[PDB]
Amino acid sequence: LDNGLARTPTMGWLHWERFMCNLDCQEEPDSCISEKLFMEMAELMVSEGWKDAGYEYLCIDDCWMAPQRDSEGRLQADPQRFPHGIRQLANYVHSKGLKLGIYADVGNKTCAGFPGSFGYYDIDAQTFADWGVDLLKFAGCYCDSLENLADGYKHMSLALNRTGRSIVYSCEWPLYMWPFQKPNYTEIRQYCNHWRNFADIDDSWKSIKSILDWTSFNQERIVDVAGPGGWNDPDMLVIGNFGLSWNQQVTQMALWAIMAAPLFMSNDLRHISPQAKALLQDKDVIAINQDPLGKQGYQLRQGDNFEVWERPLSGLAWAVAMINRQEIGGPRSYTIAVASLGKGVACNPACFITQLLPVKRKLGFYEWTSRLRSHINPTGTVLLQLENTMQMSLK
Amino acid sequence: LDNGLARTPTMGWLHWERFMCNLDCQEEPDSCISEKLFMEMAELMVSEGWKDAGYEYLCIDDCWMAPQRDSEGRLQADPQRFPHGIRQLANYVHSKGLKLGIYADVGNKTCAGFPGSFGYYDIDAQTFADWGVDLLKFAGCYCDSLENLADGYKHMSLALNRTGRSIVYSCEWPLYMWPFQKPNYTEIRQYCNHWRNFADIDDSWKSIKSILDWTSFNQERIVDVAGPGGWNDPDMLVIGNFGLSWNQQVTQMALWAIMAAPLFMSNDLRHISPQAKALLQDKDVIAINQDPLGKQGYQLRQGDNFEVWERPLSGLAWAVAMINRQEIGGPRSYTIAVASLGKGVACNPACFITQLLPVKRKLGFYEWTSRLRSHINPTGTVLLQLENTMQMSL
Numbered sequence: 039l040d041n042g043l044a045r046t047p048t049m050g051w052l053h054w055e056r057f058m059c060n061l062d063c064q065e066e067p068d069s070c071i072s073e074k075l076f077m078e079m080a081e082l083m084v085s086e087g088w089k090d091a092g093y094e095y096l097c098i099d100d101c102w103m104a105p106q107r108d109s110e111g112r113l114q115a116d117p118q119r120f121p122h123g124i125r126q127l128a129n130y131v132h133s134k135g136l137k138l139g140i141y142a143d144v145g146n147k148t149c150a151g152f153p154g155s156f157g158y159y160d161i162d163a164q165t166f167a168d169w170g171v172d173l174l175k176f177a178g179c180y181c182d183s184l185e186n187l188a189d190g191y192k193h194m195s196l197a198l199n200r201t202g203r204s205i206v207y208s209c210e211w212p213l214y215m216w217p218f219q220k221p222n223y224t225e226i227r228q229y230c231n232h233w234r235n236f237a238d239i240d241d242s243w244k245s246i247k248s249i250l251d252w253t254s255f256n257q258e259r260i261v262d263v264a265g266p267g268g269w270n271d272p273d274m275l276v277i278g279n280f281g282l283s284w285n286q287q288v289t290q291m292a293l294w295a296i297m298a299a300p301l302f303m304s305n306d307l308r309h310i311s312p313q314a315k316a317l318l319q320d321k322d323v324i325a326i327n328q329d330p331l332g333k334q335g336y337q338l339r340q341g342d343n344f345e346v347w348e349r350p351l352s353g354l355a356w357a358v359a360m361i362n363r364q365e366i367g368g369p370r371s372y373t374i375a376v377a378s379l380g381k382g383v384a385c386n387p388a389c390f391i392t393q394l395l396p397v398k399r400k401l402g403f404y405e406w407t408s409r410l411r412s413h414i415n416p417t418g419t420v421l422l423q424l425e426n427t428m429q430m431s432l433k
Numbered sequence: 434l435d436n437g438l439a440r441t442p443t444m445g446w447l448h449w450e451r452f453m454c455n456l457d458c459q460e461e462p463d464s465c466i467s468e469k470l471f472m473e474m475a476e477l478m479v480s481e482g483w484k485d486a487g488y489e490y491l492c493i494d495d496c497w498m499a500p501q502r503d504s505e506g507r508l509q510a511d512p513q514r515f516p517h518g519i520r521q522l523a524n525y526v527h528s529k530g531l532k533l534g535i536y537a538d539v540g541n542k543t544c545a546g547f548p549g550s551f552g553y554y555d556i557d558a559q560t561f562a563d564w565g566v567d568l569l570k571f572a573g574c575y576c577d578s579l580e581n582l583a584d585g586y587k588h589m590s591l592a593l594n595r596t597g598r599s600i601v602y603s604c605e606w607p608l609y610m611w612p613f614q615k616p617n618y619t620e621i622r623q624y625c626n627h628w629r630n631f632a633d634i635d636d637s638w639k640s641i642k643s644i645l646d647w648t649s650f651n652q653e654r655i656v657d658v659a660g661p662g663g664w665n666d667p668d669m670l671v672i673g674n675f676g677l678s679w680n681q682q683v684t685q686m687a688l689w690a691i692m693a694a695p696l697f698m699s700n701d702l703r704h705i706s707p708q709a710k711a712l713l714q715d716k717d718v719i720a721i722n723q724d725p726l727g728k729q730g731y732q733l734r735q736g737d738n739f740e741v742w743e744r745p746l747s748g749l750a751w752a753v754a755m756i757n758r759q760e761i762g763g764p765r766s767y768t769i770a771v772a773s774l775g776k777g778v779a780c781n782p783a784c785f786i787t788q789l790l791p792v793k794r795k796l797g798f799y800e801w802t803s804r805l806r807s808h809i810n811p812t813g814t815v816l817l818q819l820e821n822t823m824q825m826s827l
């Protein structure tokens with residue numbers, strides 16, 4: 039979407055995976071979907087270095103709305119969970135140097151059953167803009183046809199544009215066309231800053247594998263369409279929660295960087311381990327994700343339960359991820375000819391290789407004809423950055 | 434099996450899940466299947482308190498033997514990787530106060546392709562006993578018929594007995610019987626100290642779930658057959674490796690205790706986190722697994738992506754495990770009437786409840802009519818011990 043936004047993948051925090059649709063503030067006030075939850079996350083995004091690392095969008099997902107629209111046909115924030123309203127929340131978030139995301143649905147209801155935006159696109163867009171909303175995640179539940187789906191996504195895009203406010207537009211458009219209708223990504227990209235292609239992530243390694251396998255399976259269709267202003271969205275980072283081993287967390291962080299994915303954490307910033315914090319704030323890995331060239335990576339090869347992915351970067355550099363998909367045994371040796379990497383230009387005549395994950399380590403100079411040996415933990419990933427030696431010497 | 438062994442579930446260490454069939458001592462000397470690997474694990478089993486916690490059997494799995502039998506038809510320790518032989522290794526292990534486990538296969542080959550024991554049951558049994566072997570894991574690969582399968586497991590059982598040496602007998606009989614017909618567990622119990630029922634575990638939450646779901650689905654067939662001398666074997670503990678979140682590791686430890694499972698760790702004792710060590714060595718959880726009554730637990734109820742399991746213990750006590758199977762969101766509250774637990778006798782007229790996992794905490798006294806509320810992490814388990822107040826006052 040040509041709105042000057044998402045020139046690199048959007049980074050922030052989104053409540054959904056970790057907090058879901060918890061409406062019980064009586065029994066669980068510290069985990070219910072409430073203004074207090076978001077104000078606390080906003081404070082910690084500043085104080086715990088998240089904003090500094092690049093995470094700037096504090097985003098509300100489903101279940102913020104009151105059951106009905108007001109007498110002027112406007113969406114309402116829930117009166118008891120958001121008693122001070124969205125505007126005051128937006129002001130609070132802005133005072134921290136952060137941006138606010140909100141959620142709506144193209145159909146008659148949100149996925150959780152609250153008011154949908156169909157028939158109210160213009161009113162809702164103007165409502166969000168006036169509040170100072172900076173991002174909209176627009177979901178595709180409760181839509182009677184694919185024609186109405188597409189039209190609704192386009193209408194809301196134009197309506198947001200007409201407000202004159204810069205608002206990141208995140209769409210679930212192509213997801214709802216799966217598996218029989220092939221999305222027109224040229225069209226989707228014209229209207230959206232990012233788009234969900236695949237089913238919801240959850241707190242499991244199985245879901246991460248499924249997203250990676252569906253991405254690589256469809257990579258010819260989707261990789262080249264991504265770029266500054268329009269990204270493939272493989273869903274939230276779930277690092278720091280309950281269902282992932284350390285190696286699986288490393289794999290998600292590495293691969294979301296390779297995929298030029300928007301980076302929306304869904305976790306509890308009040309209760310997150312130092313290790314998970316350090317991984318999510320990894321300066322070098324975020325720099326790969328945020329690479330200005332904005333070319334999405336891809337799976338180069340797979341076999342013997344190993345996967346090699348790579349991403350072209352600015353300065354003729356490359357990021358390379360090697361995944362051990364064998365879920366038994368110990369750290370497993372993997373050897374690759376560097377000549378196979380980066381279309382055969384990355385290490386011609388030579389490259390300098392730095393390992394970034396699971397630990398940072400300068401590996402040295404590798405000539406065009408040489409081989410690279412790594413040991414990779416089961417379900418883990420080794421992430422490397424390759425610099426072509428001619429680029430290095432030249433200023 | 435009535436050999437006086439495995440009166441409580443066997444505890445030890447087994448190489449397979451972590452080290453597999455690594456034969457490359459040239460490129461990977463620290464992880465190849467070699468005498469040095471087992472000697473190092475033996476030292477650490479003592480020095481790091483594993484033996485003291487109850488882990489006493491140091492077990493060799495597949496890929497210890499040479500490609501061929503010797504001219505006397507004996508299995509041979511691989512000459513490059515076990516140059517000093519198994520006898521010397523057994524002597525070394527015994528000197529540490531530990532017991533040695535070894536591996537063979539009922540069919541023509543082991544699963545990795547090494548010589549199988551078919552046609553050699555007596556020779557192999559005598560070979561093992563002479564060496565000082567204390568446990569045999571007997572796998573079911575490359576067996577052409579169900580008759581040869583059953584007869585082979587029976588033959589080896591009797592052959593080990595005939596040596597006069599006490600040897601724990603671990604069988605894959607029901608597992609290899611399953612793809613064809615329901616096993617006869619009465620017969621299996623007669624011949625085996627423990628038996629593998631289900632597919633191999635690996636370093637994944639997926640495999641743990643599959644084992645639990647298979648066990649709970651088939652619990653009517655298998656729970657009551659287990660007891661002192663003969664246990665259901667849901668495979669190795671994989672805590673301390675690569676593929677499990679902390680919550681998933683807690684779940685495995687808790688449920689292997691509920692299930693009265695043999696506890697064979699498969700991990701690298703040279704490189705194990707303090708957290709994983711403390712869980713695997715948890716004295717209260719091990720005491721549940723090792724409960725002298727030896728009655729296997731079971732799934733009590735299931736629904737709303739929660740599972741409740743319980744195990745009767747000696748002295749009118751109960752272990753209760755609550756699993757959160759919802760793999761999204763946060764810690765989820767689960768409430769149960771205590772009158773539903775322990776067939777309604779656990780907390781009549783009251784019980785004292787202590788949480789053991791994920792952290793140890795006394796919860797208090799609960800009347801028969803009361804409800805217990807717990808918050809459980811996604812893929813995690815809360816493990817409780819219930820003590821009846823009648824028993825406490827006595």
Ligand SMILES: *[C@@H]1O[C@H](CO)[C@@H](O[C@@H]2O[C@H](CO)[C@@H](O[C@@H]3O[C@H](CO)[C@@H](O)[C@H](O[C@H]4O[C@H](CO)[C@@H](O)[C@H](O)[C@@H]4O)[C@@H]3O)[C@H](O)[C@H]2NC(C)=O)[C@H](O)[C@H]1NC(C)=O
Nearest residue numbers: 039040041042043045196198199200201202203204205266
């Ligand atoms: C509503 O829709 C309209 C029409 O699509 C949209 O107008 C577009 O806005 C973008 C972004 O502001 C314009 O793109 C800019 O064009 C100018 C002149 O060519 C450039 O100088 C800009 O360069 C930026 O990006 C560079 C890197 O690529 C940076 O180095 C530099 O610093 C600049 O930031 C940029 O390319 C685009 O021209 C218009 N399109 C048209 C046809 O008018 C408008 O923004 C939308 N409004 C809202 C509120 O959404």
Ligand SMILES: *[C@@H]1O[C@H](CO)[C@@H](O[C@@H]2O[C@H](CO)[C@@H](O[C@@H]3O[C@H](CO)[C@@H](O)[C@H](O[C@H]4O[C@H](CO)[C@@H](O)[C@H](O)[C@@H]4O)[C@@H]3O)[C@H](O)[C@H]2NC(C)=O)[C@H](O)[C@H]1NC(C)=O
Nearest residue numbers: 434435436437438440593594595596597598599600661662
């Ligand atoms: C080869 O197979 C034979 C026959 O299957 C097997 O002989 C059996 O050994 C067991 C265990 O030693 C015997 O059971 C014991 O019998 C004695 C005497 O009657 C009892 O004292 C024991 O009672 C309990 O008390 C012990 C407390 O110290 C406990 O340790 C024990 O587990 C009991 O709870 C016990 O019942 C059994 O009598 C024989 N069976 C026959 C038919 O002789 C033999 O052990 C096998 N040999 C090898 C080397 O494996």
Ligand SMILES: *[C@@H]1O[C@H](CO)[C@@H](O[C@@H]2O[C@H](CO)[C@@H](O)[C@H](O)[C@H]2NC(C)=O)[C@H](O)[C@H]1NC(C)=O
Nearest residue numbers: 188192220221222223224225226227228229263
């Ligand atoms: C996918 O959508 C794009 C954009 O709507 C289509 O490309 C346009 O095609 C129309 C004619 O139908 C032309 O007027 C425009 O010039 C095209 N725009 C661009 C930017 O290419 C494209 O035809 C669609 N692809 C398919 C196969 O349906």
Ligand SMILES: OC[C@H]1O[C@H](OC[C@H]2O[C@H](O)[C@H](O)[C@@H](O)[C@@H]2O)[C@H](O)[C@@H](O)[C@H]1O
Nearest residue numbers: 054099100101148149150177179210238
């Ligand atoms: O309600 C917010 C939710 O909306 C979308 O997901 C809808 C449903 O998708 C799957 O069926 C999933 O199993 C359910 O949990 C969920 O209700 C959206 O894709 C999500 O990201 C989220 O915003």
Ligand SMILES: OC[C@H]1O[C@H](OC[C@H]2O[C@H](O)[C@H](O)[C@@H](O)[C@@H]2O)[C@H](O)[C@@H](O)[C@H]1O
Nearest residue numbers: 366449494495543544545572574605633
């Ligand atoms: O070779 C030792 C091994 O033997 C048995 O497992 C054989 C194979 O079973 C499955 O196909 C599995 O996927 C493989 O990893 C495995 O090699 C036995 O059940 C194992 O415990 C182990 O002893």
Ligand SMILES: *[C@@H]1O[C@H](CO)[C@@H](O)[C@H](O)[C@H]1NC(C)=O
Nearest residue numbers: 145146156180181182183186
């Ligand atoms: C919403 O419901 C109305 C009335 O049933 C229907 O006409 C309309 O097409 C629906 N909108 C969508 C996008 O499903």
Ligand SMILES: *[C@@H]1O[C@H](CO)[C@@H](O)[C@H](O)[C@H]1NC(C)=O
Nearest residue numbers: 540541551575576577578581
């Ligand atoms: C082993 O192979 C021989 C020769 O093919 C065969 O007679 C025998 O039945 C096999 N044994 C088993 C148990 O598979």
Ligand SMILES: *[C@@H]1O[C@H](CO)[C@@H](O)[C@H](O)[C@H]1NC(C)=O
Nearest residue numbers: 616617618619620621623624
């Ligand atoms: C199991 O085998 C035993 C022989 O040890 C036999 O007595 C028994 O009838 C079998 N069980 C059933 C119910 O088929």
